[PDB]
Design a protein around this ligand. Sequence first.
Ligand SMILES: [Mg+2]
Ligand SMILES: [Mg+2]
Ligand SMILES: [Mg+2]
Ligand SMILES: [Mg+2]
Ligand SMILES: [Mg+2]
Ligand SMILES: [Mg+2]
Ligand SMILES: [Mg+2]
Ligand SMILES: [Mg+2]
Ligand SMILES: [Mg+2]
Ligand SMILES: [Zn+2]
Lengths: 50, 177, 116, 39, 135, 75
Amino acid sequence: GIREKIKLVSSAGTGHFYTTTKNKRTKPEKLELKKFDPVVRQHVIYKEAK
Amino acid sequence: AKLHDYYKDEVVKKLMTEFNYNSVMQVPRVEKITLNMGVGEAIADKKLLDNAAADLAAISGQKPLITKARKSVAGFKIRQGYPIGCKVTLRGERMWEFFERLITIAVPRIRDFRGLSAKSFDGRGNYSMGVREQIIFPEIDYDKVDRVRGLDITITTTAKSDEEGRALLAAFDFPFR
Amino acid sequence: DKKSARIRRATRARRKLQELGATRLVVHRTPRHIYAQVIAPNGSEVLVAASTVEKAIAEQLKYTGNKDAAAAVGKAVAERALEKGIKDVSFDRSGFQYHGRVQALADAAREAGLQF
Amino acid sequence: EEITASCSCGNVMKIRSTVGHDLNLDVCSKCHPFFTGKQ
Amino acid sequence: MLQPKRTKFRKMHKGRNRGLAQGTDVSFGSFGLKAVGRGRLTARQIEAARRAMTRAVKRQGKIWIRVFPDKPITEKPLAVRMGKGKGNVEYWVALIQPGKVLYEMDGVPEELAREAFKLAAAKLPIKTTFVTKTV
Amino acid sequence: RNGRDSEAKRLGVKRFGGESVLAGSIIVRQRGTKFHAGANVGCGRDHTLFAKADGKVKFEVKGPKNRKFISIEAE
RNA sequence: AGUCCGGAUUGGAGUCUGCAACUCGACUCCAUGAAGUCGGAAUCGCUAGUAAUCGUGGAUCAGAAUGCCACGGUGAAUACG
RNA sequence: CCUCCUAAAGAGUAACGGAGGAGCACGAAGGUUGGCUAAUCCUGGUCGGACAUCAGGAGGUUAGUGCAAUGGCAUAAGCCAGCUUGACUGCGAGCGUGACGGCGCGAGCAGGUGCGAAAGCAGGUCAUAGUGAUCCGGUGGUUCUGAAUGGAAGGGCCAUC
RNA sequence: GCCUGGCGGCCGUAGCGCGGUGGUCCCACCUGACCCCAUGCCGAACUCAGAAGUGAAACGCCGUAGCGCCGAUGGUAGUGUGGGGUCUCCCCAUGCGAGAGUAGGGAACUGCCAGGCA
RNA sequence: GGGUGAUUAGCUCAGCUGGGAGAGCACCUCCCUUACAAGGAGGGGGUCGGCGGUUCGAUCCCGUCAUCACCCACCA
Ligand SMILES: [Mg+2]
Ligand SMILES: [Mg+2]
Ligand SMILES: [Mg+2]
Ligand SMILES: [Mg+2]
Ligand SMILES: [Mg+2]
Ligand SMILES: [Mg+2]
Ligand SMILES: [Mg+2]
Ligand SMILES: [Mg+2]
Ligand SMILES: [Mg+2]
Ligand SMILES: [Zn+2]
């Protein structure tokens, strides 16, 4: 798998991730993204792919 | 400021009496002066351009600007958008300072000088020239050389003809064979 | 070129607000005589005009073409628009950076009561 | 910064230059062998 | 032998030959050879007629060819089943509508042009006729 | 081996001039902006020109570059 | 250090020889300062005042030597075999 | 699976008809605000050369649009920088296109973000390909169920492999 | 009533080019650049305070047909329906009528507001 | 006809999943030899059959043309 499928786990106390695709040979770093989380229904920073 | 004011009185009245224009804004004035250095052999040595930029920011007063490679060619084995050369644009007070410190103290330290050429104009009134050595500017300590890196100068003016630009620069020294 | 360059900077909003169809507050800047216009949504009919080429703002004032003039320009626009019943508008930056005299003009319009 | 150049022609000339040091010269625009060189 | 040096594509549909011609007025030389029938000409026919004309005036005079093929004819080979793709190209043709001026000549007498064109008219699949310079 | 083609994507004008249409009705499925958005018309992300209000459909020809605009009337 | 080493090549100005210096020379001066930082495989000489190095004289000739003939200054190593 | 022609000017239309591409990519190449306009040729310019980087002129989209083609793009959908996560969730009046499963466009509502002073824009990329039904099982969450009862194993639902 | 500045309707009968004119006012070039702002280097741009010069360039108006542009009438090509022939094509009756080309037209037209002028 | 591989210095082969052309024999100049061959040291030689092209760029990637080698050409 060249471009590989990963997820975006919320840093809150909520068991929710989004899901997207990353590459290996372009990004050695993990992905930080602010995103909505429908438990507290606000926007939380996301990290921890897979 | 000096050769600026020298223009502002003598060259203005001189050219107006020469070409008897309808108005004074129709006279040639120098619009900008650009300076280029093609660093191309720095395809491998990335800091060759960094020290050449320090050299040009010692020649000029102001910090330079790198140039992006426009379109990639295999004739020079370059990639499109490559760190490829460095330029300095000059307008206004620093432009007149650079022209002052050029024509007074740099042209006669050109290696084995004879007067500059005649057909070096564009055809629509601009000028350009290229150097060989680079301690012709005083800001370079002789014990700091690392290549024979030259550079070229472009005086861009509003001369509506190259002969008008010739008569503009004949008010200066501007050696003229 | 300069004039057509500014118009192709402005044509963005000058046809988007057309397609919205709302009342437009249009400006023209020159370091002498800032101009201010309030135009109906179609674009062919103006409503409220105030400019420093008019004597009533020219003679009461320090210098034609500074932000301290433009403040009173938009203030006069706001009074002449409220007396005709126009307060809810939209703004035409006319290809100008919202930084200088247009910023002072619109801010003093908002302090005067023109509320877009 | 403005400095002062001075050549051997007696041409004391103050100029702005980013040398950061006063300057000694020989040839100026005044008294250079350009016309004698062409001759 | 007259052949496009490069073409945009290999092949072309069959197409039709409906209607009349355009290149009708004599516009270069003094005398003209004009198509009356309707059909298509090969490069071999065109070259052979050119050789006949240049034979009759022997070298001297100037001769115009107003036509050029720019249309191939695909030909499936002997003993190939139908289908399996459109055939390969073996000869090029020109589309002929009636009234099309084919050849043109200047620098000779009228009777000589007249007999040279009747020599080359037998080289051609169609009836052709003789025209003069007009307005 | 040469013969091949896609499935045709059923483009074109679905509702012509002079028809009382309803809101959100697709009028034109096109690729570029060969037909241009105008009064009461949104341009889709595939440039599907879609309607915003009830009423008729009028093909205007406006603009300096002689473009083709679609509009919804009321009466 | 291509260095005050090295001297080619070249520009100019000379001198003397000889009918004669372009095909040709010898020398002085001014200026120039290439490669060459110890030499691939191979290869030469030499048992004592020689090996090596530094000068000089002659013969040829009207004019030349880094060549030939001859002389002098200093002056080694190794031989178990 | 996508694009053009064959397609006879609504849609569609076959063949071992003529020609090409896709089984990917991106944390910017996405969103927004502010802003800019390319190819090619000529001239002048040290190494520098038919062609690197500079300046001017003609020209005016021939260039670009992540890629094959077609359509389109100057209000740029091409290019630069700053700020950023709307490549958010729950819904959907209505429409289109397929026999069906499905696929696609979507104004607008509630919550809650980013950009802009504001009017406003943003439910991924200019669009059209970049894909896999069901079953079976994996992982996380759970106002569901729990074979006497309380739990559990399992089953469901939501998310996904 | 004239000119100028802005916003529009229309999108080349409005656009190119060539010659002429305009600066009280309006417009542009311009002066200076510490701070607002800004240059991946530069007050070239963007921005700011101004008004010494100037219509050179640019903009507006006037005149002119070297091109772009519009463009009939008639005829031709094609075509729907019906009939036919020497049916690769074409004709007859009837309805519809191009494109190109020809004589021509032509240096735009109209509205809202403000300022200077009579 | 049709599917598969090859055209490279004078000769024979690896270089084709994209950015510098290598190996061996031969050739040429020296060396020891009375003189060759063998042996030791040192060099250059192609424009990758050809036509077009994609791309910044082709021996390499794509479509034909000339030549070579191989496999098929069955039911009858
Ligand atoms: Mg002995
Ligand atoms: Mg000797
Ligand atoms: Mg039809
Ligand atoms: Mg269709
Ligand atoms: Mg923008
Ligand atoms: Mg469970
Ligand atoms: Mg039980
Ligand atoms: Mg003028
Ligand atoms: Mg017509
Ligand atoms: Zn001096």
